[PDB]
Design an enzyme around this catalytic site. Structure first.
Site, short mmCIF file in Angstrom:
data_model
loop_
_atom_site.label_atom_id
_atom_site.label_comp_id
_atom_site.label_asym_id
_atom_site.label_seq_id
_atom_site.Cartn_x
_atom_site.Cartn_y
_atom_site.Cartn_z
N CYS B 152 11.18 29.76 19.73
CA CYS B 152 11.13 29.94 18.28
C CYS B 152 10.13 31.04 17.90
CB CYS B 152 10.84 28.64 17.53
SG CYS B 152 9.53 27.60 18.24
N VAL B 156 10.75 34.20 15.39
CA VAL B 156 10.16 34.26 14.06
C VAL B 156 9.51 35.63 13.85
CG1 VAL B 156 8.31 33.51 12.50
CG2 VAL B 156 9.86 31.81 13.49
#
Ligand code: ICS
Ligand code: ICS
Ligand SMILES: [Mg+2]
Ligand SMILES: [Mg+2]
Ligand SMILES: [Mg+2]
Ligand SMILES: [Mg+2]
Ligand SMILES: [Mg+2]
Lengths: 477, 522, 522, 477
Positions: B152, B156
Site C-alpha cells: 500500500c 500511496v
C-alpha cells in the site's frame, strides 16, 4: 569448528552478493570471542534491511499491534488502514489470556477500518470517528481502545491524535493513537518503542493522583512477558510462592487496570529487555521504581533469577526463595534425569527476534546441548553485548540473517536441531534437520519456569529423536 | 508441578487447582473485571435480533473480515510460474505476513522478497530499492523471472513500476532481456483475488502484448486454463487429470502445485515446476482460454478477449455435478475430443453416492462464506444435494455477483429461504447463526471462534464448523483435497454427510438418555 | 405431537417431556428395573482391574467378537471374478446375512445365491439342491462361472461338493465345460479371512491343477497380485496405479473393485469387471505371485509354491513407509523395472507430512483391532509415526502372528508399553481401554459402543473411535479410501493427526475455561 | 396396466425359468381380484424356496433371535454355535429400547458360544454350561438368559434343554432353550412360532400362582410391535392418552417381567399377527384373554383402530378416544395439506416380510399415493387373505419373489417409488427409482401412530422428490 573455519565460512557465503550488499552483510556476521566486552567490534545491528535479500523481519505495526498492545485483553485494538495487516496478524501470536472473547476480552479478534480507495483519497479521520462510536455500541464492556496505524495513515496526512482526544473525552474511556506505520524504523524494534511511548503518554499517568490502591512491601510487576503458551502464568506462580504479590503482567493476560497500577509497585522484573526497556526506564525516572533483568528459561537460570529477585526484598522473601527452589528441586532433576541422556552433545542453531536467541541457551545447556550458532532479527548492540558471554568460543553469530545466509550456514555447520520461526521451519525439515518453533513454541509450551522446562525438554526430545528423520532417503537410491 | 511421566502443556496444565486459584486472585485483585453476571447479560444480548439489527447498521467498523489484501494474491499467482521469484515492491513487514499466512495453510516454505521501503522512500520514492532489490534478488536466489507487485505504501506515494524497472535495466542492475513483469496491487482495492487477476494480467501482457503479429488462434492446438487463486492442490491436479483422460492438449497458466508440495528427501527446492515462459509466450496460439474462477478474473478476461482474440466461454466454476458437466462438454465442443466413458463412470459414481446419502443431507441448513467463485460453486452443489444454504456471505463480492447468486437460488426450491450478504464479515455471520440457526457452517479456520460462541449459549445452540476454504490453520493436510469436478464433489459430499452423522452420534451417545438412537447402521 | 414445520424423528422426539414422562411410568410400574444406584454400581465395577481379571479368565463365552465366518470371505473372493456368481451350498439364512452385511458397508448391491438346504437335506444330504441350484442360477442370472462355498449345515452333514457338482454335470443340469470351482468353508474354523483363502485356492486349483505340463514360469512376463479380503476400493486402485506407474505388467487375481462401485446411470449391472478366466488360466506363466496379505493366504501360498512353482516373496502387507518401500523394491527386483521418480516424490511427500505432523502424533496412545495383516500394518505405521500402539487385538489370529508382532514391537522404543492379544473380543478390549486408557481407538463401527461406555464413566474417560477397517456402517463412503502404499499412509496420517486436533479443539472450546488454548493455528 | 397386461407380464417373466422352477413359481404370482375371498385360489405361500433363485428370505434363527427374543432388553440372548449368525445380526435391526447396555440391558450386544471344530466334533453342551456361568459372573444384573440355536446344534444332537434346566434351577433365573436352527422351516416364519412356543413353555407360566399384581379394568398389552425407530412408543402414547394402561409390549423395549405379567391383562392388542398370533391364541385359550388385530399406519387406520380398541371397553374410554382423535385432528391434517400435493397420484411397489406389505397401504393412500404391487418374503395364506381388500384390482402380488422377478416387474411396472429391504435398496437406486427401506425405515421413523405419520410423509416426499433423481443421465449421451 575452529574460529578460522567459521571466518572462512562467512567469506565463502559472502561471495554471492553484489558488491554493495556484500559490503553491508560482512558487518552483520561474526564469530564469537568471549574476551570482547563491546559487541560493536565484531557485529553491527539495528540497520536497514537490504532490498531483495529475503529478510525474515517484519514491521513496526507488528512490534506495536502484534507484540506490545495486542495482548492487552480488555481493550479493542483497531488495525487502522487496509485490511491485510490485521488479517495476517489475527491470532498468529499465542499471547494467552483469560476472557469471554467478543464481550469483555478481544485479543483474538480483528477490528479494522478496512480502507477503501475513498478512504485513501479523502482521509479516514471521519471513518475512524464513526467506527469508534460503533465499537461503543456493539462492544460496551471494552475498557478502552488503541488505534494501530498501518502504512497509509502517515502518508495521507490523517490526524488520529485529534480523533483520539475527542473520542476519549466523549466516551470517558482511554483512546490511544499509535503511529506504528510499518514504513517507520527498519524492523519490529521501533514498533516496541513507539508502543512503549504510547503507554507512557496516554495510559500510565492516569492514577498519578489516585492512591486508593493498597500497596504492600512485596508488590512487583512482570514486564515484557507476553504469556506465550501461558509463559507468564508459569512465571507468576513462582513469584507468588516466593511471597511476592504480582500486581501486573505486561502484556500477556494484561488489563488496562493493571498497566495503570504498575506505578504503584516496588520492583519491575523485566523478562524481555528489548521490547519494554523503554517503559521500565521511564518508570524508574518518574516513579523511582527500580528494575532488574531476569531469565526463566531452564532451572539454572530460573534458580539464579529467583535468588537475585529475592535479594531485592527482606529475609522473609529470601527464605521462601530457598523453599521454592527446594520444592521444585526433584521435579527439574527428574526432567534432566530422563531427557539429558537422549540429548547429550546435540548441537543447535537458533534464529529469533530480540530476546530468545540468548535467553534460551541456559535451558539447552542444562540438557547437555550446545548452541553453536545464534542470531536476532531486529536486536541492538546492547542485546549482542549480553550474548557474548552466553555463546561459547568460535560460535557463529548473525544479525538480520538473509534467507541465503542461514541455509548455507546450516548446510556447512550441519546442526542436529534448529530453533527458529514459521518461515524457516519447513525449509529445514525437508533437508532433514529436526526443527522447533522458538516463537510459537510449535503450539506447545509454556517454556518459562520450572513447569515450562519439562515441556521444553519433552519437545526437544520428541522432535530431535523422532523416527521421521531416518526415512528421507529413498532406500533404492 | 509436573510429574515426568505425565507432562502437561498449557492445557491441561493450568486446570490444576493451584493455577486456577492463582488466576482467580489475579482477576479479583488487579483486573478490575466486569462482574460475571454483567458479562453473561451482555453475551446474551449479543445473540439477539436486536443486537443483529445494530450490527447490520455498521458503516465504518469491520470485525473479523473474511478476505485479505491484493499482494497476497499476486504472490500466489507468481509462485505458479517456472523458477519465478515473487517480489513485492514496498514495505518488508507486508511480505513477512504473506509468507507466514501461506506457511500456515500449506505447511510448506513460501519464497518471496521485499525491497524494504522505509521512511526515506516516503518522499523521494523507491527507485533506489527497485534498482538494488532486483539486482540482489537475481544474484542471491537466481530466479529466471521476478514478478513485481506492490504494498500500500508504494501505491500511496505513486511509484511508477514501469519506469523504475526500465531504469534498473538501463543502469545494468539486471540484464535488459531478463523478464520482470509487474502489476499494481493496491491493498485498499478489492482483495487478494483482485491481486491474483492483476498479477496474472501483468504477466500475460509482458509476454504477448507486443508479440501478436505472428500469432494465430488455434495454431498450437491447445486450450489455456487459468485457475485463479487456488489453495487446494487437488484442484490443480484434478483439472489436469481430466484433461489427460480426455486426450486434451492444455496449458495450465499459473501452476503452483509442484512448488507448494515439494518432497522431504534431504534437499530444499526453492523452485519447482510451474508454467514455462514458452507456454505463456505461446498462449495466444491456443484454441481458446478457460477461466476456472470467472468472478475473480475480470481483468484477465478483458485482456484475453481484446489482445489474444480468445472468446473465453461463459463457464461457471466446475464445482458440483451440473457445472462439471458444462465444463467437460464445453472442452469437448472446443477441442473436438469426446468425453470418455471413464469420466461418465466417475460421474455415475458421484450420482450413486448422492442417492445413497440423500436422506442425511435433505433439508440440512448451512451457513457459508469464502471467495465468490468458491461460494457460488458450493451453493450450487448444496442445492443439488437438497440442502438449504440459508446464510451466504462473501465479504469480497459485488452487487453483480449477488444478483447472479439470487438467480441461482431462485431456480431451486431449496434456495427459497436463503439470503446473500456481500461486503459483510464474520461478526455479521456470528449474528445470523444465533438468530436463525443453521445445522453447520461451511468456512475457514476463522469459523471455530463462532462455533465457540454458539456453544457458550448452550450445546443445543452450538453450530459445528466444516473446514472448506482458506485459510485452514488448525487442521493438517486438508490443502491436498479437491473441491473441483466430480472428484471434488465426491470429497465434499463425504465430508458433509459424515459431518451430519458425526454430530448425530455425539447427540445420541448419552447412555440411557439419547442412545436409543445410537444406531450401528446409518 | 408433531409441528409440520419442525417434524422430529425418534431423536429428539422421544425427548419431549410427555414421552419422557411415559417411559418413566413404564419403567416404574412393569419393568422391575434394578435401582439406578445398583446400575451405576455395577457399571463402575465393569471399569475396574478386578472385573478385568475375571473378563480375561473367560474360557467359553464370547462377547462382541471382531470377526465373521468363512463364507463371508468366500463370497467376497468370488465377486472378484468376471461375471461370476458366488453360490453358497447350504441354508439360505446365511446368504440373507452375507448380502446385508456387505450392502451396509459398501452401500451397494451384493449378488449371491443359496441352494436353500432345509430339514429334508439333513437325513439325505443336499445333492438335489446342488443339481437344481446350479441349473436355476445358470438360467436366471446367466453367470459365466459359479463359485461354490458352504454353510455350516452342509459342512456338518458332509456334503461332497466335488461329486455333487460332477453328478449335476453328468445328469445335464449344467454343461461339461461350465466352470464351477468349489470350496469347503466351515464357519467353525478360523474366520471370514480363512474363507477368502479357501475360495481363492479353490478357484486357482480348478483352473490350473491339470494344465501345468504346458506352463513355463516367466513366460507371460507378468507378476500376479493376490489381494486377500479387502473392503477399501482405494486399495485395489492404489496397487493398480503403482504397477502402471512402474510400467509393470500385472494380473490382479480377484478384483471386485468395478462390481463394488458401479455407476448409478439408469441401469443395474449385476456383473462388472473382475479377473478373467484367461488371466487365472494364464497365471502359472507369470514370473511370480505376490500375496498382499500373507497372514490370511496360508493355503494359497502353499498351492502357488507347490503347483505353480512361484517362490512367493516374504513381503509384509504394503502399509506405511518401510513396507511400501519393500514392496516396490521387490516388484522392481522381479520385474527388472526401476521405480520411477513419480513414486519417489509421492514417498517424499508422505515424509514431509510426517515431519509436518509429528509434534501432534508423538506419544499418542492407541487401541487397535481388525484383521491380522491390517492390524500388523497399522501397528507398523504407528511406530513409524511416534505413536504408542498400547492395546493391539486380533480376534482371528494365531500364536505365530502374535510372536511376529511382538518382534516388530520389540524393534521400536515406541513399542515398549504394548501388548498383543489374540483370540480376544471387543468386551476384552473394553476393559483394556478403561484400565489403561489410550487417547483413541482405531477400529470398525463396533467400537462406537465402547466409546459410549467410556463416556458414561466421564468425558475425561471417553475414548473417541477413529473408524478404519471393516465393517463401517455408520459413516458413508469411507469404503472409497485407501490404506495401502504411500497414498494409504497419507490418508491414515491425515485421519489420525486431524482426529487429535479435533478432540483438542473439543476440550478447549470452553469459553473462559479451557479456551486459552483454543488456538487458530496448529 | 390392465389385468390382461399384468398376466402377460407374469408369463413373460416365467419364460426364463427351467421347467421345474417354472411350475413352482407360477403358483406364487397373482393378479389381485377383490371378488375372491379365498387367497389360495390365486396364490400359494409358505413353501420352501427354490434352489439358486436368489430369494430375499432369511432363516428361523432370524425369526426367533433376530425378531422375537433379541429385543427383550433385560435378558441375555446367546447365539449358540459358530460366530457368523450372531455377528451379522448384531444391531442390524432398530428395535429401540431404554437401558444401560452391558449392565442391565443387552440388546445391541453379541453373546455367542462361538463354536470351534472340537465343539462340533464332541458337542458344545459343556461349553454352553460354562458359558452360562461366565455370564452370571460378568453380567450379574441380567434377569434371564435365552439360548438361540444355530444350524449345527440340532445336527450334532446337543441337549440344550438339559443345560437350560440345570442352570435355571442352579441360578434361580430363567434359562430358555430355543431350537431355532436355520435349517428348520423355510423362512423366518417358523422362527416366530418356535420362539412363541419357547415363551409359552418356559416363561409365561411363571406367575400363574402369584396374584400380587394389581389389575385394572383398562389393562392391555401390545403384542407384536418391536419398536422400530420408537414405533411402539408412538403407539403406546395414544393408548395411554385414551385411558388404557399398557402393561407390556412384545417385544420392543420389552422386559421379562412385562411378559410374565401379560396373562394378567384384559385385552391383547396384536399389531404383527404373523409373528405373535400363536401366543395370543394360547393366552385366549389358557387365560381367557381376548385379542384383536389393529393398524397404526396413517390416520385412517389409526383412527379406526383406536375406535375399535375403545369399543372393547366402556363409555368413558370411547369418550376419551374421541378426544385423542380431536386433539390430533389438526396435526395430521397439516401433514396431509403439505405433503399430499407433492405425492398425489404417485405409484409404489412394496416387498417386505409378513405384515408391512399390507399394513402400510392406507398410509400411502392418505397421501394420494397408489400401491400398484405388493408381496411378502414369508407370509401365509391368512396374510394374503387379509391383503385382498387392501390392494386395488388388477394389482400385482408376489410371494417369495426372486431377484430376477422383482427387477423385471419393476422395469415393466415403472413405479415412482419402491419400499423394500437393504438387499433391494441399492439395485433400484441405480435404475433411477426412488427407494425407501420399509424394514429399517432408512434409519428414520417412527412411522407408527400420528407422530409417525408426519415422519413417514416427510420421508416419502424427501426421497421421491429428491433432485438427485433428475440427474442420472449424462447430458452428452
Ligand atoms: S517481545 Fe519480541 S520475534 Fe521480546 S518481537 Fe517477537 S514474544 Fe520473539 S525473541 Mo516472535 S523480543 Fe517476544 C519476541 Fe522476543 S513475537 Fe515474540 S517470539 S521475547
Ligand atoms: S415381526 Fe416380522 S421382515 Fe412382523 S420378521 Fe421382519 S419388525 Fe418385516 S414386515 Mo423385517 S412380519 Fe416385523 C417384520 Fe414384519 S424384521 Fe420386521 S420389517 S412387522
Ligand atoms: Mg516443526
Ligand atoms: Mg509440508
Ligand atoms: Mg428419552
Ligand atoms: Mg452405493
Ligand atoms: Mg508442530
Amino acid at each position: 569448528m575452529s574460529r578460522d573455519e567459521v571466518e572462512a565460512l562467512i567469506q565463502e557465503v559472502l561471495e554471492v552478493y553484489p558488491e554493495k550488499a556484500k559490503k553491508d552483510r560482512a558487518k552483520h556476521l561474526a564469530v564469537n570471542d568471549q574476551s570482547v566486552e563491546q559487541s560493536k567490534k565484531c557485529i553491527t545491528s539495528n540497520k536497514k534491511s537490504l532490498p531483495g535479500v529475503m529478510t525474515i523481519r517484519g514491521c513496526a505495526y507488528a512490534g506495536s499491534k502484534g507484540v506490545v498492545w495486542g495482548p492487552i485483553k480488555d481493550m479493542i485494538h483497531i488495525s487502522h488502514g487496509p485490511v491485510g495487516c490485521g488479517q495476517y496478524s489475527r491470532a498468529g501470536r499465542r499471547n494467552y489470556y483469560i476472557g469471554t472473547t467478543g464481550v469483555n476480552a478481544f485479543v483474538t479478534m480483528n477490528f479494522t477500518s478496512d480502507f477503501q480507495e475513498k478512504d485513501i483519497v479523502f482521509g479516514g479521520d471521519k471513518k475512524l470517528a464513526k467506527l469508534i462510536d460503533e465499537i461503543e455500541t456493539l462492544f460496551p464492556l471494552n475498557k478502552g481502545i488503541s488505534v494501530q496505524s498501518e502504512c497509509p495513515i502517515g502518508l495521507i496526512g490523517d490526524d488520529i491524535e485529534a480523533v483520539a482526544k475527542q473520542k476519549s473525552a466523549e466516551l470517558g474511556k482511554t483512546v490511544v493513537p499509535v503511529r506504528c506505520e510499518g514504513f517507520r524504523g527498519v524492523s519490529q524494534s521501533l514498533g516496541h518503542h513507539i508502543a512503549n511511548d504510547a503507554v507512557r503518554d496516554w495510559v500510565l499517568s492516569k492514577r498519578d493522583d489516585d492512591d486508593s490502591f493498597e500497596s504492600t512491601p512485596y508488590d512487583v510487576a512482570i514486564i515484557g512477558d507476553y504469556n506465550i503458551g501461558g509463559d507468564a502464568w508459569s512465571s507468576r506462580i513462582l513469584l507468588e510462592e516466593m511471597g511476592l504479590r504480582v500486581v501486573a503482567q505486561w502484556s500477556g493476560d494484561g488489563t488496562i487496570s493493571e498497566m495503570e497500577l504498575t506505578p504503584k509497585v516496588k520492583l519491575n522484573l523485566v523478562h524481555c529487555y528489548r521490547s519494554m526497556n523503554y517503559i521500565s526506564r521511564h518508570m524508574e525516572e518518574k516513579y523511582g521504581i527500580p528494575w532488574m533483568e531476569y531469565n526463566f528459561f531452564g532451572p539454572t537460570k530460573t534458580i539464579e533469577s529467583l535468588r537475585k529477585i529475592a535479594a531485592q526484598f527482606d529475609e522473609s522473601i529470601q527464605a521462601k526463595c530457598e523453599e521454592v527452589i527446594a520444592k521444585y528441586k526433584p521435579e527439574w532433576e527428574a526432567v534432566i534425569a530422563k531427557y539429558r541422556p537422549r540429548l547429550e552433545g546435540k548441537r543447535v542453531m537458533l534464529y529469533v527476534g530480540g530476546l530468545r536467541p540468548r535467553h534460551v541457551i541456559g535451558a539447552y545447556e542444562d540438557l547437555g546441548m550446545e548452541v553453536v550458532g545464534t542470531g536476532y532479527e531486529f536486536a541492538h548492540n546492547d542485546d549482542y553485548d549480553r550474548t557474548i558471554k552466553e555463546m561459547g568460543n568460535a560460535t557463529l553469530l548473525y544479525d538480520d540473517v538473509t534467507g541465503y545466509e542461514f541455509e548455507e550456514f546450516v548446510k556447512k555447520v550441519k546442526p542436529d536441531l534448529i530453533g527458529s520461526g514459521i518461515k524457516e521451519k519447513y525449509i529445514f525439515q525437508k533437508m532433514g534437520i529436526p526443527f522447533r518453533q522458538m516463537h510459537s513454541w510449535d503450539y506447545s509450551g509454556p517454556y518459562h519456569g520450572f513447569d515450562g522446562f519439562a515441556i521444553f525438554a519433552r519437545d526437544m526430545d520428541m522432535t530431535l529423536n523422532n523416527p521421521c528423520w531416518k526415512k528421507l532417503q529413498a532406500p533404492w537410491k | 508441578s509436573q510429574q515426568v511421566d505425565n507432562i502437561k502443556p498449557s492445557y491441561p496444565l493450568f486446570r490444576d487447582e493451584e493455577y486456577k486459584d492463582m488466576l482467580a486472585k489475579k482477576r479479583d485483585n488487579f483486573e478490575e473485571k466486569h462482574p460475571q453476571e454483567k458479562i453473561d447479560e451482555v453475551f446474551q444480548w449479543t445473540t439477539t435480533e436486536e443486537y443483529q439489527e445494530l450490527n447490520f447498521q455498521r458503516e465504518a467498523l469491520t470485525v473479523n473480515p473474511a478476505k485479505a489484501c491484493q499482494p497476497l494474491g499476486a504472490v500466489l499467482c507468481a509462485l505458479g510460474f517456472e523458477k519465478t521469484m515473487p517480489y513485492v515492491h514496498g514495505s518488508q513487514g507486508c511480505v513477512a505476513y504473506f509468507r507466514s499466512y501461506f506457511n500456515r495453510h500449506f505447511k510448506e516454505p513460501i519464497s518471496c522478497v521485499s525491497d524494504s521501503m522505509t521512511e526515506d522512500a516516503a518522499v523521494f520514492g523507491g527507485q533506489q530499492n527497485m534498482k538494488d532489490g532486483l539486482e540482489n534478488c537475481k544474484a542471491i536466489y537466481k530466479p529466471d523471472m521476478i514478478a513485481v507487485s506492490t504494498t500500500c505504501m508504494a501505491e500511496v506515494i505513486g511509484d511508477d513500476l514501469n519506469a523504475f524497472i526500465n531504469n534498473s535495466k538501463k543502469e545494468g542492475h539486471i540484464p535488459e532481456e531478463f523478464p520482470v513483469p509487474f502489476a499494481h496491487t493496491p491493498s485498499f482495492v478489492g482483495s487478494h483475488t483482485t491481486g491474483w487477476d492483476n498479477m496474472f494480467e501483468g504477466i500475460a501482457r509482458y509476454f504477448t502484448l507486443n508479440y501478436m503479429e505472428d500469432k494465430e488462434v488455434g495454431s498450437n492446438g491447445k486450450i489455456n486454463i487459468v485457475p485463479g487463486f487456488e489453495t487446494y492442490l487437488g484442484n490443480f491436479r484434478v483439472i489436469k487429470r481430466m484433461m489427460n483422460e480426455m486426450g486434451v492438449d492444455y496449458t495450465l497458466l499459473s501452476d503452483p502445485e509442484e512448488v507448494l508440495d515439494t518432497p522431504a528427501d534431504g534437499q530444499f527446492r526453492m523452485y519447482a515446476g510451474g508454467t514455462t515462459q514458452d507456454e505463456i509466450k505461446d498462449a495466444p496460439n491456443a484454441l481458446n482460454t478457460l477461466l476456472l474462477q470467472p468472478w475473480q478474473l475480470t481483468k484477465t478476461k478483458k485482456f484475453v478477449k481484446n489482445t489474444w482474440k480468445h472468446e473465453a466461454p461463459k463457464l461457471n466454476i466446475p464445482m458440483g455435478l451440473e457445472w462439471t458437466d458444462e465444463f467437460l462438454m464445453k472442452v469437448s465442443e472446443i477441442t473436438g475430443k469426446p468425453i470418455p466413458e471413464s469420466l461418465a463412470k466417475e460421474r455415475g459414481r458421484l450420482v450413486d453416492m448422492m442417492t445413497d446419502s440423500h436422506t442425511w443431507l435433505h433439508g440440512k441448513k448451512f451457513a457459508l462464506w469464502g471467495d465468490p467463485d468458491f461460494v457460488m460453486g458450493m451453493t450450487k452443489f448444496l442445492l443439488e444435494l437438497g440442502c438449504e444454504p440459508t446464510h451466504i456471505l462473501c465479504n469480497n463480492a459485488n452487487k453483480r455477483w449477488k444478483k447472479a447468486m439470487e438467480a441461482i437460488l431462485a431456480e431451486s426450491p431449496y434456495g427459497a429461504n436463503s439470503e446473500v450478504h456481500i461486503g459483510k464479515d464474520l461478526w455479521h455471520m456470528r449474528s445470523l447463526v444465533f438468530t436463525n440457526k443453521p445445522d453447520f457452517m461451511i468456512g475457514n479456520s476463522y469459523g471455530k471462534f463462532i462455533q465457540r460462541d454458539t456453544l457458550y449459549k448452550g450445546k443445543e445452540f452450538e453450530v459445528p464448523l466444516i473446514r472448506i476454504g482458506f485459510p485452514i490453520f488448525d487442521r493438517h493436510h486438508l490443502h491436498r483435497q479437491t473441491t473441483l469436478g466430480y472428484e471434488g464433489a465426491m470429497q465434499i459430499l463425504t465430508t458433509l454427510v459424515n459431518s451430519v452423522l458425526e454430530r448425530l452420534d455425539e447427540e445420541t451417545r448419552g447412555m440411557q438418555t439419547t442412545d436409543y438412537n445410537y444406531d450401528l447402521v446409518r
